[PDB]
Amino acid sequence: GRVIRNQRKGAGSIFTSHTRLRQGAAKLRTLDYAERHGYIRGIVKQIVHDSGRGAPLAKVVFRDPYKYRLREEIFIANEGVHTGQFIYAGKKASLNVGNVLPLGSVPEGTIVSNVEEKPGDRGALARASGNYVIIIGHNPDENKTRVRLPSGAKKVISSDARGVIGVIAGGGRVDKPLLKAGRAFHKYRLKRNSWPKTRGVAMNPVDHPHGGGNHQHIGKASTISRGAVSGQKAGLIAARRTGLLRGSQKTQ
Amino acid sequence: AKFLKAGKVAVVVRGRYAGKKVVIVKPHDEGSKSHPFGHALVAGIERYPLKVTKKHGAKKVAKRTKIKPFIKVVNYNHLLPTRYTLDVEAFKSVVSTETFEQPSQREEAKKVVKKAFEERHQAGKNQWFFSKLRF
């Protein structure tokens, strides 16, 4: 055989991210004495598009506490924020749409986004357009907070992890059908070379596990071991079930 | 009560001396031939005197404290009337309508106004007047 397509991507020659026009990495502020004691004020200078990204970014300017100059940040813009607004960052900040707060300080049923997994990592969970986590009860012992992640998974994270308030802008982006290929073409143009896609059952046997045959057919079962190897994994990987789903959907 | 009076402070909002402090010396309220609008004569200061300190003494204190003043005619629209007050008996008869419209006649007033404002800064009277509004 040859080397399969999906094995080729790891070397990253032509499969790298296209990133000329991007604005910058979309982190939060670096955690310091000002944010874990009182608060600190910044202004949103302008909100703006970012290439290969469904949500808009906010260029947010603070003032530096230890030397006379300004500091420019790039936040993911929540559904609500407008230019000229004051973003109030840190521990002692009120429960407002756009402010960044520690997960201990908010109450239950609160809807936050762009939230840290471990404190000081600067952004981690719920960053796509129209996404959020729900805080669902706290734990005073060992300062841990129990949350609900966008997939339906229920995690327990640190209470000192930060999290900007509200949902993320660009909600309902996947509703409108693309209609034509030209729109898919232009979408991926500014992400990575992963379009268009040829089916394995349409190739010769050198190229795939599903190759060859006098008809187009997979030939053996399409569900595959967790512990196969590079070259065998093509199809449904570690599939505990399959087929069109019946009964109640989503996580309990 | 009507606040635009002879003894009142204001902040200029447009034109060269914008963001500086003045005093409305003579309010010509109801129009005119030349200047056909609500206008007012002013008498404020151009260059503020610097922050003197306890290290400085004798000679540098004199150089840090020199007030170049000015005089103007100004529309009410281009002034912020403020609740602070400053007296105008020191230069009432000097500045007038007849003082303007003559290049040489403007200096004699300025030299008399400079005498009023430098006498006021030495020994603290009207501190808000001799401090720069910062923007």
Binding site: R63, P65 | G124
Partner: peptide, 29 residues
């Protein structure tokens, strides 16, 4: 007393630029 004033600065988060303190405990040797 005569001309100079007393107008304090407030070193207490998000206001006034912090002064030049002794930072000997935190130096990356």
């Amino acid at each position: 007393n005569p001309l100079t004033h007393s107008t304090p600065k407030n070193f207490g988060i998000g206001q006034a630029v912090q002064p030049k303190r002794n930072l000997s405990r935190y130096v990356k040797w």
